[PDB]
Scaffold this motif. Sequence first.
Motif, PDB file in Angstrom:
ATOM      1  N   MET A 295      -4.458  27.127  40.166  1.00 31.05           N
ATOM      2  CA  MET A 295      -6.167  27.217  40.226  1.00 31.05           C
ATOM      3  C   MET A 295      -5.476  25.400  39.603  1.00 31.05           C
ATOM      4  O   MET A 295      -7.036  24.885  39.787  1.00 31.05           O
TER       5      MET A 295
ATOM      6  N   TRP B 115      -8.569  23.102  41.365  1.00 32.84           N
ATOM      7  CA  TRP B 115      -9.937  21.794  40.687  1.00 32.84           C
ATOM      8  C   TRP B 115     -10.037  21.393  39.828  1.00 32.84           C
ATOM      9  O   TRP B 115     -10.723  20.305  40.078  1.00 32.84           O
TER      10      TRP B 115
ATOM     11  N   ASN C 145      -3.935  13.712  35.200  1.00 31.98           N
ATOM     12  CA  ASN C 145      -3.962  12.146  33.668  1.00 31.98           C
ATOM     13  C   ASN C 145      -5.442  12.218  33.114  1.00 31.98           C
ATOM     14  O   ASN C 145      -6.939  12.596  33.966  1.00 31.98           O
ATOM     15  N   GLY C 146      -6.039  12.873  31.785  1.00 31.02           N
ATOM     16  CA  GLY C 146      -6.690  12.747  30.928  1.00 31.02           C
ATOM     17  C   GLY C 146      -7.306  13.704  30.859  1.00 31.02           C
ATOM     18  O   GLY C 146      -8.592  14.104  30.248  1.00 31.02           O
TER      19      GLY C 146
ATOM     20  N   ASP D   4      -8.706  24.040  27.115  1.00 36.04           N
ATOM     21  CA  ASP D   4      -9.600  25.066  27.057  1.00 36.04           C
ATOM     22  C   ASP D   4     -10.115  24.945  28.170  1.00 36.04           C
ATOM     23  O   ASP D   4     -11.024  24.088  28.064  1.00 36.04           O
ATOM     24  N   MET D   5      -9.603  25.714  29.297  1.00 35.27           N
ATOM     25  CA  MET D   5     -10.762  26.031  30.833  1.00 35.27           C
ATOM     26  C   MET D   5     -11.788  25.704  31.144  1.00 35.27           C
ATOM     27  O   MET D   5     -12.079  27.205  30.605  1.00 35.27           O
ATOM     28  N   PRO D   6     -12.084  25.499  31.899  1.00 34.83           N
ATOM     29  CA  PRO D   6     -13.756  26.002  32.588  1.00 34.83           C
ATOM     30  C   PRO D   6     -13.464  26.984  33.224  1.00 34.83           C
ATOM     31  O   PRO D   6     -14.504  27.778  33.528  1.00 34.83           O
ATOM     32  N   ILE D   7     -11.530  27.237  34.379  1.00 34.72           N
ATOM     33  CA  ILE D   7     -12.729  28.498  34.634  1.00 34.72           C
ATOM     34  C   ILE D   7     -10.755  28.890  34.719  1.00 34.72           C
ATOM     35  O   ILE D   7     -10.684  28.280  34.003  1.00 34.72           O
ATOM     36  N   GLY D   8     -10.994  30.092  35.070  1.00 35.54           N
ATOM     37  CA  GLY D   8      -9.594  30.903  35.218  1.00 35.54           C
ATOM     38  C   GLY D   8      -9.253  32.016  33.495  1.00 35.54           C
ATOM     39  O   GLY D   8      -9.914  31.100  33.050  1.00 35.54           O
TER      40      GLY D   8
ATOM     41  N   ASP E  50      -5.306  29.044  29.943  1.00 37.16           N
ATOM     42  CA  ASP E  50      -5.070  27.935  28.944  1.00 37.16           C
ATOM     43  C   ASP E  50      -4.157  27.752  28.680  1.00 37.16           C
ATOM     44  O   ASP E  50      -3.719  28.647  28.040  1.00 37.16           O
TER      45      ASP E  50
ATOM     46  N   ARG F 290      -5.189  29.665  25.170  1.00 42.49           N
ATOM     47  CA  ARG F 290      -4.976  31.250  24.943  1.00 42.49           C
ATOM     48  C   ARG F 290      -3.455  31.707  25.459  1.00 42.49           C
ATOM     49  O   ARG F 290      -3.411  32.677  24.570  1.00 42.49           O
TER      50      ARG F 290
ATOM     51  N   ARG G 238       4.333  17.157  30.210  1.00 47.46           N
ATOM     52  CA  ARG G 238       2.819  16.358  29.905  1.00 47.46           C
ATOM     53  C   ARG G 238       3.049  17.949  28.358  1.00 47.46           C
ATOM     54  O   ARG G 238       2.298  17.053  27.200  1.00 47.46           O
TER      55      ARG G 238
ATOM     56  N   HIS H 148      -8.611  40.459  30.163  1.00 43.56           N
ATOM     57  CA  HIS H 148      -9.537  39.729  30.913  1.00 43.56           C
ATOM     58  C   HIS H 148      -8.542  38.337  31.242  1.00 43.56           C
ATOM     59  O   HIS H 148      -8.985  37.906  32.033  1.00 43.56           O
ATOM     60  N   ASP H 149      -7.955  37.988  30.146  1.00 42.54           N
ATOM     61  CA  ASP H 149      -6.961  37.235  30.393  1.00 42.54           C
ATOM     62  C   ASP H 149      -5.480  36.886  29.660  1.00 42.54           C
ATOM     63  O   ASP H 149      -5.357  37.360  29.794  1.00 42.54           O
TER      64      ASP H 149
END
Lengths: 381, 381
Positions: free
Chosen positions: A26, A30, A36-37, A44-48, A51, A54, A101, A303-304
């Motif tokens: 992912m 993505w 980096n940054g 807080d991922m916008p997809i998938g 993260d 969670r 990181r 779901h996740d």
Amino acid sequence: SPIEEQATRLLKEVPLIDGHNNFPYMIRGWFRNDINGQDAHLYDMPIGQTDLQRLQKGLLGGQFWSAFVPCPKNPDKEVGSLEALRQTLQQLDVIHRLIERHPTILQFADSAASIWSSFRAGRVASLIGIEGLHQIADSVSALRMLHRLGVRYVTLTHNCHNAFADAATVSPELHGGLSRKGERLIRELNRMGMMIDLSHTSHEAQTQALRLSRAPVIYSHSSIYSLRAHARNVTDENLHLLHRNRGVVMICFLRELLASEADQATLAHVIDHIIYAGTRIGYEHVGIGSDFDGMLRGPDGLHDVSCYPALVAGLLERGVSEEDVKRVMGLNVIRVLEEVERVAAELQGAGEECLCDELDEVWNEDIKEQLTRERERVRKL
Amino acid sequence: SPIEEQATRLLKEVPLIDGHNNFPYMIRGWFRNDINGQDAHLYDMPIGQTDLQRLQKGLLGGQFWSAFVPCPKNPDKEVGSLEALRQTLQQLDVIHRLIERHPTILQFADSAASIWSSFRAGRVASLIGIEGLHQIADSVSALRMLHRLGVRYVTLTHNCHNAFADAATVSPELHGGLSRKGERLIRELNRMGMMIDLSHTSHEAQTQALRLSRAPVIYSHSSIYSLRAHARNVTDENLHLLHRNRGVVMICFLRELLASEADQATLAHVIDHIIYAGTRIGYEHVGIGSDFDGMLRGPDGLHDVSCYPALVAGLLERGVSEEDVKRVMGLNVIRVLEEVERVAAELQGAGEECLCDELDEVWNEDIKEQLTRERERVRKL
Ligand SMILES: [Fe+3]
Ligand SMILES: [Fe+3]
């Protein structure tokens, strides 16, 4: 609820170690592995389905992160196989950089002992598996270097036949299970201390591998054939051979593997599959292998990665004992990794010969003669 | 002799760390990296300038073992570059297996501290360098994985131009020194803690790299241009820039780089080159970089790895102080590696962005939309 407090207690006592998560792919999809940054987005991922926020929320103890790359689509199969090796190093690189990181959340682990130390320090023990022997470009040397990079299991195939074994979803069969090179590779996998993963492999390849392995194996993400007939699910015969192998079937949350109608798949179905395996081959041979991020949508209630406490509570609610739930959560996969280490240490202690790649001759006979004459010259000094 | 007892004393006090030995390629040439049952031959080799008995005999303290593979000769440059990466993993594999199988003689080291611990334990500190950026197949991710495999220096080129820099022996020039990707790579090499090696690179590539590097570099095996004009030898201008860089020129035993007539090359010529550099840029910037096994025949008095005590004694006999001989033997290259670590730790502590590979998009816009819609669905739960 008392059952939910019980679930939370278990999640603090022992690590829930998930067998297979595709979050690194992912990140390639993505971010193209440029994180980096991107801290805010990694939490807080916008997809998938995965993260870092969670991941904390669901109280997961550890994770085998998949370093999957797709089967080669190049018509030139030499280029495609070598390309997959380069891509494998890209995925291993982003996994290590992700762990590096975010040291408050993730800690690299490559052993039963390092899993525990990570868990006691409050981190998600972060292990690595590759998904298919197409990723090594026909090089056993590369395989050993992947082991040195932290890879601790190898799925023998993905959804393509390779030189070593047959995948489940592809027909017709190439080798009819394992090839002769595949049989030989199992000895080397046992010798080096690489855990064998039989998910994605054909029913016959599983049978042959389960008879030949000197160490316990896993299914990192497979479900039960008798509850849902699929090429990717484990038959009663292979469950029987898994018991004899001392291995662990890590039950998957893929909807298509849990129900005939994918949209009807649920938390309850995952629990049915765990209980089926646990009842028939014992709860010491069953685990959890979500394959989160190998799919768009998970089952209802799963779901996740935040949903693991519901699974633990759900198992307890069905009458699975605390001791057996702890086994399913993570003690079983820890044991397999422990036994894989011990078998490797025993074979390496006995001095077993390692499998070597077939190489071309770089020197002709004239160069070799010049070298031998030169060696004798310095001997006479 | 009193000078020989002095030489032996120094070899026990501090490690003589040789900059470059090609013994791993000899193992590929002679054994095709199959060392199973070959212990007797690895101690007493039928070919070459290196074996485990002579390695002990010459009292060597440590060694950067070369993981060299040849420049790609495939007309399809995509295949050849990827092939070199697979071959690099083969050479790293045999180096690690060689060290693993002979722990009384060799001990893997990847740091100034691990060099010392190995030396105090009576082992040859065994480090690793690759010889040319053709070995990484245009992948910075692969480069970082090679670092994780134990590679601690990268020669920017061998005898071929690559995407990053110009080799010395090949004309015409491709980039005129370093490319734009090469300049950017130097920042990443400094950030990751990979020591830069400027042997085999063009005079202009050295000049540009010596100005740009934020960490000290080495010449792992190069000699002095003013004593013998060659494309592979270091000019007075680049020696001057090396001093400013704080780096180390590790003097090579290649006959062609020491004398106009190769058969006239001697121990004395190597000492002349060391003293030339030491006198002009200080003995803290000069080292020993044999390139044993990069040649058929060594200089008179430096025929193989057993001859290091003659070099140490020879330096003392010319009036080089014990303190400066100790520097040339190994303290200088240890310092460079130490400073390379410190610069990396400083840049990594400041949170400098790592260089990332350019990847293709794996998902189209439809897949990304499906993923974002799915993420919002679980948010509303
Ligand atoms: Fe999968
Ligand atoms: Fe060289």
